[PDB]
Amino acid sequence: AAKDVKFGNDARVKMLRGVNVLADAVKVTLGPKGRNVVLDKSFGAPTITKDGVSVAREIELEDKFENMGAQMVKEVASKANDAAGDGTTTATVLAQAIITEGLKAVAAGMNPMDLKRGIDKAVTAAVEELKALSVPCSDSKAIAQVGTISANSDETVGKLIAEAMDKVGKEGVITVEDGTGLQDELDVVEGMQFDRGYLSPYFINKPETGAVELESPFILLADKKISNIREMLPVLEAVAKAGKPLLIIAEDVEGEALATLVVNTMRGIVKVAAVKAPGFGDRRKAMLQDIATLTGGTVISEEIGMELEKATLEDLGQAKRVVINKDTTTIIDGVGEEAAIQGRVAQIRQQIEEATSDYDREKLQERVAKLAGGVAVIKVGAATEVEMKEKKARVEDALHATRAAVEEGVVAGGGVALIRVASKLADLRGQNEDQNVGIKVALRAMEAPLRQIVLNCGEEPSVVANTVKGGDGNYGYNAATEEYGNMIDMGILDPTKVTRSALQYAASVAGLMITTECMVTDLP
Amino acid sequence: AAKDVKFGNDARVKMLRGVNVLADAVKVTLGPKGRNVVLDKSFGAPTITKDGVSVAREIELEDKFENMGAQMVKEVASKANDAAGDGTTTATVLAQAIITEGLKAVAAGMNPMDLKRGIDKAVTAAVEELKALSVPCSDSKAIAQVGTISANSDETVGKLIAEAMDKVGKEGVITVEDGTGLQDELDVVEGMQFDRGYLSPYFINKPETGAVELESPFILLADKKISNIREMLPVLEAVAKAGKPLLIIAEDVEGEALATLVVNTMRGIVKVAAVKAPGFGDRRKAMLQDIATLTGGTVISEEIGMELEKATLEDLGQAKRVVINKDTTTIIDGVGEEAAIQGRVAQIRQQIEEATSDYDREKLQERVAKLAGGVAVIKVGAATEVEMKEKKARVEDALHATRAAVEEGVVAGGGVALIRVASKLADLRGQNEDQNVGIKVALRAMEAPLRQIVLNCGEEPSVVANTVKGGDGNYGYNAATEEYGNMIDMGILDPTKVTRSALQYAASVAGLMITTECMVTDL
Amino acid sequence: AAKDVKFGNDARVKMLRGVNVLADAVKVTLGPKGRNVVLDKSFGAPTITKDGVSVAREIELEDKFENMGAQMVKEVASKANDAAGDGTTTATVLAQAIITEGLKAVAAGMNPMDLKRGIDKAVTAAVEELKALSVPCSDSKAIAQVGTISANSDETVGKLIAEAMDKVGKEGVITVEDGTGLQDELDVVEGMQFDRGYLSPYFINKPETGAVELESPFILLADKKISNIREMLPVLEAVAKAGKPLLIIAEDVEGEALATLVVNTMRGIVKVAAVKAPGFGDRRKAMLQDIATLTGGTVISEEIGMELEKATLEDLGQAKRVVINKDTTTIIDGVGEEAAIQGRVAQIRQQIEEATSDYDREKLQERVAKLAGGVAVIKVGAATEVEMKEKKARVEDALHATRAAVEEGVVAGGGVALIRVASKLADLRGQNEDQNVGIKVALRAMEAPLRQIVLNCGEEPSVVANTVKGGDGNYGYNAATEEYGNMIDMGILDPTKVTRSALQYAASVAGLMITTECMVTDL
Ligand SMILES: Nc1ncnc2c1ncn2[C@@H]1O[C@H](COP(=O)(O)OP(=O)(O)OP(=O)(O)O)[C@@H](O)[C@H]1O
Ligand SMILES: Nc1ncnc2c1ncn2[C@@H]1O[C@H](COP(=O)(O)OP(=O)(O)OP(=O)(O)O)[C@@H](O)[C@H]1O
Ligand SMILES: Nc1ncnc2c1ncn2[C@@H]1O[C@H](COP(=O)(O)OP(=O)(O)OP(=O)(O)O)[C@@H](O)[C@H]1O
Ligand SMILES: [K+]
Ligand SMILES: [K+]
Ligand SMILES: [K+]
Ligand SMILES: [Mg+2]
Ligand SMILES: [Mg+2]
Ligand SMILES: [Mg+2]
């Protein structure tokens, strides 16, 4: 359709007004004293949230140029949530401050391209200084503090996430889901815990629990679906000769074969039980082979060539314990070679590195946590649905912050890290004066997270920013108690990945936005 | 007519929005780095001003509740201008800060009238501490610096005011008028100044200042009261064609014989005005004879017997300029005869030597002081009329500030004195907790002039205010050079009267107006 | 009423948009290649003008903020026209350039008051360098070239003004009026000129120039002042039908009762005017007698004894034309008797020879200079009324430029003098960096007249400006022939007063108005 075209300072003012609207919506949540934002949902109750990415996503303005500004600065929070999962509010606070100060220098006649080059140089040096300033975060108390701070100073969430990471180890996978109670519940599972139940209700060895218990059972892995008892009849006879129980992981055991095997189960000759193979095509085979590696067995398939008729006891897998139930199944201490397990771990890690999709990579990480280590599920307990959503978002942010802490390290929180970085970058210079001014607006905008935290606390941002800049090291401002001290000692830690990602994405988008002169939108 | 009524928080936020609009329009002019405001006038070209009271008076909002708030804060600037002539922007800034903090405290559930009592107690104690903190102008001797600071850091205006007050004395009358060239001029000429008032409000000239001016005025003097119009009709007829506006100095004139007939007869080509005669009886005759001898005229008396019909144009006196104001009427330059003026001066000096009673001696020393001091006139030199108006307003502000400085004293400028008196009152407590919070509101709002000065400088008001409060004494923040130092040493001095009046009027209106729950206006 | 208030950049860009509209409408007329502007008038046919002040005065915008900006820049052209009479377009162009560059520097975050101080310092130094650069104008060819350049390169107007100033002297009075024919006619007739102004503002005629004119006026002279109306009512009765407008020259005229009574009695059929007489006492009587003998009339005096009622139509004087302005009143042609005028001239010259006092000799030789010079009346010959108005405005501009040239001096035309004085001030520095940027803004805006002249020529202003700045002295760019050369040699001379006044008034208003953060207007 027809277009409205704005040029120069008019377009810059409209875009900055949109950025200010989005950033003022976002930044009322920053810090521990930050407040919540209600987002109207056309389907369901409104969402009360303290995370900046949701309130950034929900912002869309009537003025098309202001809507441009809002969308472009919303990209900052979207990217910061995609990469680190935390610091979206900090990223938007940084992006707004670079844009306002960058447009001040743009209105001062300085070249926006050179300003963007200066911002990029300053933020590259800032990332280097953050990496130098960072301390690795491996101990449990530091992780608990990171999870607490990232969850609006909720010590319960931080300690629960610290315990979960301690339980599942470094290779473990932790996810957050809703709970039925009012309290946070941690559910840690070990070994293979694929979510398929028994094909028939009659396998139950323990009727008082509905769970089949198999002590040191054999494990058959059929990559094909079976409906006749003929094929594994030699295997069934060999198992009956051995006398140990047998568990089948197959694509489908149904009809005739299933009926005869449950009949043989209640006859007592074989304590057999069959369950469906997990996943779907191109994924079922890989983690079926993972189960085989864990249990020291081999998968029976037509592609690999051997049939169930020539399958023997050596072909079948081995574990010390097997638990069947309605929804899932647990295999405890599969008898497999350790070196093969680590080789499979390395292979799936290489697949993770080669994976360019979040879904495939997260499935591979889940498989790694299944075969090695454990899986933790955090049930968010809340009296109401809106508190469930708010607490779930906070726990997710805390989990992402703990993951970023172990990935890259921690720095002093509350924006003190960016303050120290900007203080260290005082002598950085560009190629010309416009680049130096861009560096200076980048350094000044690194004070924006601390200033906005103090503004949310109700104190004076200038006084506290100058006081923190006067101090050295991790000395900073406790925004909850409104005091001063070594931010590490008071447990206010920020993930280096979160702060660095927020700074980088804010700098990139903000430089691209201050470089603009003309904006072309649709007419109202 | 039909009334729109708002209650509680709705009325309070509407009123505070009006306060904020007026106070922003005023506060953009505070400090040396403050900017100008253009006021559109249907009279002529728009006027550029750095004066707070002009911007405040020109503000009127469309929303009736916001308009009520704007008018009520405009009262602050108007009262500050009437009482001191300077600090209207400071008064408006202090008023807005008190209103904002007091309304925050009202929203905090606390009693607004106890807040008002606390503000009043805090400002009474601050006035006491400002009187204690004040340095007399004789001890300071910084009239040039005070005039420079009040003229937006213009050293020429301060130097001119200092020279005028050195020539005609600290109590001498100084009058600001438009010059002809591009440069300011100082002329100490023989003149008269008497604290008397014009009679009927239909004599106001084209300027809106309320003081009428006359170009080469005719002077008529009388101690007895006229009995009929036909007695003084030829005299008016004598001024009917003679190109000198008639100023009549008599005891007291009513409107029935003069004002109504001169309104009906005359459309206003030449301003004819009458004034009261200061003193009574022998004193009235004495100053009438003195003014007649200044202007070369004569005084008609019953004992003399010479009537106004026999009076001619040459017999009556003539001046070069006369400015009539309600507070004080001045004759800038009466020619007369210099030898006659000197002889009259010597005669009154010999009368001083002869006289011995305290009242006669003091009134006669007042006469000789008025004669010797004369009138100092400052010609505002500017290239254009808008520059003329702006520079005239700045010189008038400098004159008012220097007069307040010699009358009351001087303190540290740039809101530093208010910072100091707020620091000295941290121990002050009211009757209850609400009064204590009102005291804290007043003390926090006393920092507002400095913070607004810094905001106009573009720096950080919190950092500068905390640095100044960390210091003691005249330590403050030079906003012209953006750096700290002893405020007296760098010449940034504020009149004690100006600061005290701004604080008092802002506190009074703001404390009265934070106690409002309901607001009633038209629709 | 209700006020719309704008702040900061919004108010600044609205005001600058108004400035740009007014300045474009004015600037399309700059230079020899500049075009005309048609102004619609409610009284009749539209007027075509190349004069900047007419276009500037007629500009009024619908948007209130833009209208305020337009009025403030209209002040520049009005002041330039009132002072010099030429360079209104140059003044507006310089004003707009200073406003644009200063607002750019304000958007650059810098202090606008320091920018204003820098602009004022730079323009003061430029005025000094223009006084140094000025060459005294003591050539008839220089007068002709100044008149030609100021009349849009019309050599006939320049030659006519040169002949007039050669005939009546460089200090003689020259009056421009309409001519019946299609050609300009220079007539050096015997006339009177005295620097006096009218009293009653009602006496302004149908033309809006502020000067009244009379067709074959009756002359009345007086050294004493009458008392009642009845002393002059019969004369007012006689002139009531006499066919000649009654001009009265008394000692000190006033419309205290004359103006209102003549307003009530007369609706405006024929103008009646009263003006002051120059001098006082014996000197006033001397010039009154001289004017009476020039017009063949008599002066009423108490010593002489002859009264107004005694005087008849034949006894009192009569003239052919009288033009009354506030600055100076002229009697273009008082017939009287030629032999009587010659005898009076001889007697007054004999009075010079007899007198030995310096003041007496100088006033008597002023009398004979006024008598001998007379009035040089220029008849504007044009085929139509709109052409008559345009050519009359051009001749008036040429006259004002020649007056400013013989008063102050001449410099290179076409903005070259401003280019040179901007080049000489590249070393000038202010108190701080913001004042330096204001100085640079003023210096860059001093190139604006030349750049706008080139833009009206259609060539490239940057190339021509850089070529001129590369040169030195009177080297400049002849815009009539679109080629470079010595500005003085090809006769493109500008008055020093015109350029200096344009620069000063533009600088004053622009420096005052780039310092504005808030603007308050109606809704
Ligand atoms: N008690 C505290 N004292 C000081 N700083 C704190 C405190 N608690 C949190 N912070 C700081 O608050 C900043 C941001 O907190 P918050 O979690 O609300 O924002 P965010 O991570 O930017 O937002 P989001 O979850 O939308 O990505 C961090 O830099 C953190 O160090
Ligand atoms: N160089 C300076 N440094 C610091 N403060 C200054 C300086 N010059 C002036 N001030 C302060 O700024 C104020 C003067 O501002 P301004 O004269 O514009 O307004 P005002 O005094 O409130 O009154 P008004 O607007 O009626 O003239 C005073 O408080 C004075 O002490
Ligand atoms: N032939 C020419 N070559 C170069 N410059 C010229 C020439 N003729 C005139 N000028 C210049 O152009 C200007 C005259 O233009 P114009 O008379 O239209 O406007 P102005 O002087 O600004 O005043 P106004 O519009 O009030 O008459 C002067 O600066 C003069 O020096
Ligand atoms: K947040
Ligand atoms: K002010
Ligand atoms: K022109
Ligand atoms: Mg967060
Ligand atoms: Mg002031
Ligand atoms: Mg011209």
UniProtKB/Swiss-Prot annotation, chain A:
Disulfide bonds: none annotated. It is found in: Cytoplasm. The modification N6-acetyllysine is found at residue 116. InterPro entries: Chaperonin_Cpn60_CS, Cpn60/GroEL, Cpn60/GroEL/TCP-1, GroEL-like_apical_dom_sf, GROEL-like_equatorial_sf, TCP-1-like_intermed_sf. Phosphorylated reversibly during heat shock. Can be UMPylated on a tyrosine residue by SelO/YdiU, probably under stress conditions. One of its GO terms (molecular function) is isomerase activity. Its main location: cytoplasm. ATP binds at residues 29-32, 50, 86-90, 414, 478-480, 494. During the substrate-folding cycle, the two GroEL rings separate for effective substrate binding and chaperonin activity. Ring separation is triggered by ATP binding to the trans ring of the asymmetric GroEL:GroES complex and avoids formation of functionally impaired symmetric GroEL:GroES2 complexes. Activity of the GroEL-GroES chaperonin complex requires Mg-ATP. UMPylation of the chaperone by SelO/YdiU negatively regulates its activity, and may facilitate survival under stress conditions. Coiled coil: none annotated. Keywords: Acetylation, ATP-binding, Chaperone, Cytoplasm, Isomerase, Nucleotide-binding. Changing residue 460 to K: Temperature-sensitive lethal mutant. At nonpermissive temperature, the rate of general translation is reduced and a defined group of cytoplasmic proteins are translated but fail to reach native form. The modification N6-succinyllysine is found at residues 33, 50, 116, 276, 320, 389. It catalyses: ATP + H2O + a folded polypeptide = ADP + phosphate + an unfolded polypeptide. GO terms for biological process: chaperone cofactor-dependent protein refolding; protein folding; protein refolding; response to heat; response to radiation; virion assembly. Together with its co-chaperonin GroES, plays an essential role in assisting protein folding. The GroEL-GroES system forms a nano-cage that allows encapsulation of the non-native substrate proteins and provides a physical environment optimized to promote and accelerate protein folding, probably by preventing aggregation and by entropically destabilizing folding intermediates. Belongs to the chaperonin (HSP60) family. Forms a cylinder of 14 subunits composed of two heptameric rings stacked back-to-back. Interacts with the co-chaperonin GroES. Can form asymmetrical complexes, composed of one GroEL and one GroES, and symmetrical complexes, formed between one GroEL and two GroES oligomers. The asymmetrical complex is the functional unit. It was suggested that the symmetric heterooligomer may represent a transient intermediate in the chaperonin protein folding cycle. This is Chaperonin GroEL.
From Swiss-Prot, chains B, C:
It is an enzyme of class 5 (isomerase). It is found in: Cytoplasm. Changing residue 108 to C: Forms inter-ring disulfide bonds. Prevents ring separation and leads to the formation of high amounts of symmetric GroEL:GroES2 complexes. GO terms for molecular function: ATP binding; ATP hydrolysis activity; ATP-dependent protein folding chaperone; identical protein binding; isomerase activity; magnesium ion binding; unfolded protein binding. The modification N6-acetyllysine is found at residue 116. Coiled coil: none annotated. Keywords: Acetylation, ATP-binding, Chaperone, Cytoplasm, Isomerase, Nucleotide-binding. It catalyses: ATP + H2O + a folded polypeptide = ADP + phosphate + an unfolded polypeptide. GO terms for biological process: chaperone cofactor-dependent protein refolding; protein folding; protein refolding; response to heat; response to radiation; virion assembly. Phosphorylated reversibly during heat shock. GO terms for cellular component: cytosol; GroEL-GroES complex; membrane. SUPFAM superfamilies: GroEL apical domain-like, GroEL equatorial domain-like, GroEL-intermediate domain like. Pfam families: Cpn60_TCP1. Its EC number is 5.6.1.7. The keyword Transcription does not apply. The keyword Cytoplasm applies. ATP binds at residues 29-32, 50, 86-90, 414, 478-480, 494. The modification N6-succinyllysine is found at residues 33, 50, 116, 276, 320, 389. During the substrate-folding cycle, the two GroEL rings separate for effective substrate binding and chaperonin activity. Ring separation is triggered by ATP binding to the trans ring of the asymmetric GroEL:GroES complex and avoids formation of functionally impaired symmetric GroEL:GroES2 complexes. Activity of the GroEL-GroES chaperonin complex requires Mg-ATP. UMPylation of the chaperone by SelO/YdiU negatively regulates its activity, and may facilitate survival under stress conditions. Together with its co-chaperonin GroES, plays an essential role in assisting protein folding. The GroEL-GroES system forms a nano-cage that allows encapsulation of the non-native substrate proteins and provides a physical environment optimized to promote and accelerate protein folding, probably by preventing aggregation and by entropically destabilizing folding intermediates. Belongs to the chaperonin (HSP60) family. NCBIfam families: GroEL, PRK00013.1, PRK12849.1, PRK12850.1, PRK12851.1. Forms a cylinder of 14 subunits composed of two heptameric rings stacked back-to-back. Interacts with the co-chaperonin GroES. Can form asymmetrical complexes, composed of one GroEL and one GroES, and symmetrical complexes, formed between one GroEL and two GroES oligomers. The asymmetrical complex is the functional unit. It was suggested that the symmetric heterooligomer may represent a transient intermediate in the chaperonin protein folding cycle. This is Chaperonin GroEL.
